[model samples]
Target: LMLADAELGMGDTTAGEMAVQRGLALHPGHPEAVARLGRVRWTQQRHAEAAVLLQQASDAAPEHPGIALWLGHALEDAGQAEAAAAAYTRAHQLLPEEPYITAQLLNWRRRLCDWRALDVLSAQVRAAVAQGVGAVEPFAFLSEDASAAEQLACARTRAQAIAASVRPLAPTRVRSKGPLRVGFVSNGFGAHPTGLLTVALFEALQRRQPDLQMHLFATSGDDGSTLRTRLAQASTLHDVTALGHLATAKHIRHHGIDLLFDLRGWGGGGRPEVFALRPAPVQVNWLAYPGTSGAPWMDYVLGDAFALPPALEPFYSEHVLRLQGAFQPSDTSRVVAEPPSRTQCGLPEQGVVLCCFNNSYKLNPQSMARMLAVLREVPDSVLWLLSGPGEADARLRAFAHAQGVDAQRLVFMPKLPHPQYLARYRHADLFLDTHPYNAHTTASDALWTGCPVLTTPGETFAARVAGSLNHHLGLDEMNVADDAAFVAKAVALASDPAALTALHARVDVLRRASGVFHMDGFADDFGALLQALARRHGWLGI
Candidate 1:
């Protein structure tokens, strides 16, 4: 699992899948193994097999925290988000002591604007954190603002404490000969946005650094597709999703990998503890995970000037590596089509369609209430929400109705393909971003599809993502600093269609002017940052 996670992070899907299969072979019928296999099937886009395996895993190990977590993920990917949510809830109940699970539940609660449930989950997470789990996600779930300095401080402190306590105890490193072997690890190695961006980047890196001897470690590889096949062909693949951290770490150590990359951070299926095994000489947090994971074993975090911005360095546990240009690679495969007409979707086409495509999980009661206020301000405005399914949608709908926004004024969309999803951006006049836990991928999608996102910056790490992305993209004009300001900014943008139109009309010029697609330059800058990070620890060869 450790090896597969590292591989998955570096965008090496092939090697990661193989590792999972090998582990399953050794531990047939193991719940974790089965779940891991299911995830891989999910990533490989083998929805049917994934559902069967995950469902079995969930049923067999209902009380096991990891089982329900993986099962929920697989179920969600299979369009069974309601079942997925219930599984998530089950895992939350089973792992009351696990802050990460609490965070997951809190995420769902917040999405549904169930502040009542969130309050309870928050208190539970607080108790777990006090117990020394050192997990910071629960706190983040409590506050969405990037400026939630106190919460961010707590998260950073917890991560550093966890990392410090684990680093010295991390098993002694193994020696390697000649060229250093590096592996990327993650469970999100399928068709998710993480995979899309990561896989493409890995392909580019492999072309440049053939000597690196890359390995792709995955816990999940859904179906067979052009992307899946390509990932399989890139490097040595492994799947260790079923194994515990120590076992996974041992396998990676046995493979002689010198460095490991963590792509998941503290999200969903991250196996950061495996690094506590010290299976490699270096462990890096690659993808942006809102904030510092506080794991002492993690040595570095990849970043860019705009993403990390100097003021944000203190929030990260690892040495920060500011890459060049945009941290996100251009998603070449995404097709931006016009959002379906309201007429076709069975709604009036005349309203000022103010759409916020962020998952409901991030929208807090405060934000949701404010959106309802926005609806009231516009004469014929409708808020189109792209929310995760299940009780979350029901909760959102209830909230909207209570807020007095007629049912017809609120719209909800189920999860759709990336291209088709992005296409939905074109139907909206303005994008109303969620506060605190802002949308990163969704914000970018909106931008790419010619929708201008009006953002209000917050103090928490999650909220900072959109702020950073917009700032980096030179859309700071649309970024607000508070809830009141955010509301004002959103309303003004929607009320002024010319301004919205004018800003989007310049997107092409902005890309050229900002050099967003300067892939080679961006790569070189990224490499330089990594080199700097390595040199910080006297490992110039990295």
Candidate 2:
């Protein structure tokens, strides 16, 4: 039993599985002992079976937070959102003093739209971060009303823990080759958001800058998507799925990659530990995650001037590498599907459609209240939102109703396929972005489909991204100052038909010509930057 626990802790689950089987024969045991076996099953992809096993583990010791936490993951993977939320709640109740436990509960509460004690929970998470007691998830922390320094502190703590656990590779003396070899590491190399954003850029880079080699180290397996296939064709795809952190780092070092860019940062499925092992001569934080990497191993962060402004530089640990256009990329090859009828979408024919496609978690009470206020003011307009996890949509509608806005005016859109999702944007009169974690890729998608995005820039990198997009697109008017101004701008845009049409026409022309979507121009500049960074770091002699 202890052997399985040890192997599972080391992440070598094969031995853990074998030992767990033996432990099962020896004793049918406690949550601490039983949860270990459940984890071995959990990591082995037997989620439904793992959930059942974890339930049994929790049944023996309902007060065990660690077991409940294991149950939450298994239940979450088993398609039981409500049960997962309950498990999270129970886990937090069992370990209320543990800020890491509190952070997990806070994240799930946002997902299931369970608004009870959210403010108190957020305060607790923030307080713990301030005290450097427990590290919170930086990705989830981005959505909170936290400061950039606070984000850096949270990540710094998390990074230290990651660094302490992973052993570093022996120093690699990498040689600069004939073609400038630059590597990218990400888990989202398939039809996911990261894939959707970078496919066009990678394709364009391969075509325009043939000498600049793009070596991709993909963590996740292929989803057999057209995007994945196209992405694979553009670069040397090194599937690092089966490899451990050390092996993956070795794999990266084996290739004479002059520079490596980690697209995932603190996002789920990222390999910061692989990066911390010093796999490349130069490592960068870019794209997908919007906050500072806060890791001593990361050399620099790549962002445009608008997003990573000089004011925010002190908050980040990495030296900044500013890009020419928007730091975020989009799928320029995306074909928007034909818009379905309003009635078919449960939408009214005559009203102005104000949509927000940010995740359910971003629609916190403050964000939802802002949208509801806009709805109350603009009586003829409906607030259309992308459906969130569990009954998030229902909770949002109830939230709107409590604020004196008719629930029918708040339309919840079921999540659709990519093309169909883009199609729905055509019917949107304006896109209302959320605070703190303003829409990143979703903002790009809406704008690419000719929908205008309205945002208020905040201090953090995550908050200012959509504003940066609008600023880059030359629609500074859309980047309002405050919440009242955000509501005022939405109401003003929805109220004006000709102006809205003109704005749409402007967006149509700007998106094509703007630096945001034109990957060709971006590729040349990016290739040069790769070379420039290589030279600056003494990897390439100029």
Candidate 3:
């Protein structure tokens, strides 16, 4: 079991899996062995079987909180939202004092829109974090009403744990330079948000700066999508999916990468330990995670003036590199297709369609309640939402039902491919953003389709992104100040036909004209920033 766990820690799933198999041969049907095998199965991408083995282990040792928690994760991977909720609930009930369990349970409940005891759960988690008691994940903490300082603490504590466990790789000698080699490492190199946001930019950077080499360290195996194919063609793609963290770092270091980008900063699926090992000379915190990395290995955090504002610098450990416009990027090549009819989308025949395609986790009590208020205030306005795992849809429907609103009015859409998903934005009259965790990439998608996003900016980086998008697009009015302001604006826009039309036209025009969407401009700014970083570190001639 120790060997299996150690192997997993190093990203060596094969060795871990084989160790589990060997152990099970010695001790057949051992609950601990079964549980460990379940963990290995999860890392092996044996999705359905992962949950099966986990549920089997849970059945045998129902009281084991560890097994129950892993069962929750496995169920989540399979998109069995309700079962995952139940599993987390069981885990939390079994051991309520464990901050990790409580945090997991709280995050899952938020995803399912299960708001009962949410305040209490959040309070307990926050209290633990405040006391420096537990290493709460920064990604999960973004969903809470936590301050920037607290979030920094959360990420720093998490970072320190990884730093303590991993051994840093010895520095490599400088290599003969043909082109400035920039490496990006992330698990989202397939048909994911990271891929969608980056592919166009990589293409642009090559065209502008032929001497700039873009290398992608793909932790995710290929998903056989057009984006994945395009990404491979656009850059030097390394399939580091099979390599453990130490071996992967050595592989990267051997390439003599001038700069490395940590696209998955503290976000799950990121190999933080790899960065902790310091594979590249200059490491950056970028696109995927929208917060201060609080990572010692990461030297810089890329942001725009709006998202990573001046006042927020105190919370960040890394030196801030601000771009002129929006920090986030979009696929400028994406064309909005002819959308399916309202009926095809589970939407009603005739009603103003107000939508917020933010993930289920961001649909917190305040965000949802405010959304409900807008629907109630403006009659015939149906809210289109992205359906989530478990009973998220049912839970939301019931939540609305309790508010004396028709559950039928809440139309839920299952996950669709990027193109199809972007097309559905046509049916959406307006995009209502979520708070403390605004729609980052989703907001970009919505606006790219000419749907105006109405957002209330918060103090934190994650909370301000949608608002920042609006700001850069010259739609500053859409950036409201508070939840009351957010709902008021949504209802106001919903009621006024001409105003909504005018706003949509502006959004359409701005999406085309905005500096934010222009990846070439972003590439230019990006290049100069890289130069600045290189000069600072003596990597390039000053």
Say which candidate scores most in TM-score. Answer: 2
lDDT of 3 by residue, 1-542 (tens): 79989998888999999898999999888888999998988888787898999888899888998899998999888888889889999998999888888988888888778888988999998987887566577898889999999989888888888888888988753334445788999998868999999988988988886767799999989999988899999999999997988999999998889889999878888988889999898888988898988889888898888898999899899988888888887789998898788899888888899899989899987888889899889889898999987778988898898787788889888899888988999999998888889998899899888899988998988988998999999999999878888888888889999998998888878878889789999889888777666766665432
As for candidate 2, its clashing pairs are none
Which regions of candidate 2 are displaced past 4 Å?
A: 12-34, 173-177, 539-542
Better of 1 and 3 by TM-score: 3
Q: Scored by CA lDDT, what does every candidate get?
A: 0.67, 0.87, 0.87
Descending-lDDT candidate ranking: 3, 2, 1
Off by over 4 Å in 3: 1-62, 172-178, 540-542
CA displacement after TM-score superposition, residue 287 of candidate 2 (Å): 0.7
lDDT of 3: 0.87
What CA root-mean-square deviation does each model show from the true structure? 8.7, 1.9, 2.8
Clashes in predicted model 3 = 3
